Design a protein around this ligand. Structure first.
Ligand SMILES: *S(=O)(=O)c1cc(C(=O)O)ccc1-c1ccc(F)cc1
Ligand SMILES: *S(=O)(=O)c1cc(C(=O)O)ccc1-c1ccc(F)cc1
Ligand SMILES: [Br-]
Lengths: 142, 142
């Protein structure tokens, strides 16, 4: 896609790495990526329980449709968009990739990356642009 | 206060009662009280980890100032006010009351109720009025 696609790929590469997997076998910009990597690790520590209940709701098979992903991701934004909720979303996507590689369905990695870039573009990009862009996120979270 | 104090007391009475403690031994409107009651239970269940990190932050001794409670509660509104964070606020106060009764400092329950009411008035009331009052919380969470 574009700059959102590039952000999704960086985050998923990091999440995969933390679990010992490489992206290569599946295929302010620096400050945005670093800040989002750090924000996702923090969110994963603080909301261990609630996050586990989220990831439980979706088990990605080669048959899962994007709409099934949207329905659970939509729960994160029920009451609107915010940075914490966008971080949760990245984290969520990262956990589905890890789960995918764990179950030897490494083909779903590029599929989740596409689903995420799409979801950011369609639903989150207007609120992001309206709230200072990714540079604001960095100034707030870096 | 007013509706806020009535809301605080109902919520605190409910929480204490759940653990087997009466409010009486220390001292649409129904749809709101009920909706908040249910929200507080669901919240306490969903954020097992995160809620525990917050309650840990303040251990109320009869010499704890309001400014102390306020500083830990500002942590709940760090990145803005939303219905969910207001629900976390009520749940937190409920925990500080159950904690006071259990730690033999059952006198504190009345002061917590007063701290909660003031916080709502000084900080939370404009956001509540701007987002359609408690009837909107009901018409969403109820
Ligand atoms: S949570 O209360 O932070 C929350 C709130 C919403 C909402 O729409 O109000 C959506 C999602 C979440 C959430 C936070 C943390 C998680 F691990 C999962 C969901
Ligand atoms: S979170 O636990 O970091 C958090 C963050 C904010 C914020 O404004 O950044 C507000 C509330 C919370 C929180 C949610 C749920 C809990 F049980 C405890 C804290
Ligand atoms: Br949690």
């Amino acid at each position: 896609s574009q700059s959102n696609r590039e952000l999704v790929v960086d985050f998923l590469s990091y999440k995969l790495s933390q679990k010992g997997y490489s992206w290569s076998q599946f295929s302010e910009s620096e400050a945005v990526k670093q800040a989002l990597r750090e924000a996702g690790d923090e969110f994963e520590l603080r909301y261990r329980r609630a996050f586990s209940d989220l990831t439980s709701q979706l088990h990605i098979t080669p048959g899962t449709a994007y709409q099934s992903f949207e329905q659970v991701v939509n729960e994160l934004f029920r009451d609107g968009v915010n940075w914490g909720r966008i971080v949760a979303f990245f984290s969520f996507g990262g956990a589905l990739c890890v789960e995918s590689v764990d179950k030897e369905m490494q083909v779903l990695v590029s599929r989740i990356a596409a689903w995420m870039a799409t979801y950011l573009n369609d639903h989150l990009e207007p609120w992001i642009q309206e709230n200072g862009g990714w540079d604001t996120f960095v100034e707030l979270y870096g």
